[PDB]
């Protein structure tokens, strides 16, 4: 799954079985690294 954005380590408390994340808008805004078990935040690059 592809996209674009700025990656930041996330302090949200994912449960062991959960793998993805979603927002109120119901779009991907949090993913878990496959090779190593870390949770990162996704935020699109600035626009205006």
């Amino acid at each position: 799954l592809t996209g674009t954005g700025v990656l930041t380590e996330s302090n949200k408390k994912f449960l062991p079985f959960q793998q993805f994340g979603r927002d109120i808008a119901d779009t991907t805004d949090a993913v878990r690294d496959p090779q190593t078990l870390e949770i990162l935040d996704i935020t699109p690059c600035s626009f205006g």
Partner: protein, 38 residues
Amino acid sequence: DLICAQKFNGLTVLPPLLTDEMIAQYTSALLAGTITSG
């Protein structure tokens, strides 16, 4: 939050030209002029 989420899909909100301080100044001016000059 939800307000910020909408901001990320091509939806934007502009700020009003007149701020609350200016609105309050206008209202106070009207009130004072009234009570002092009919």
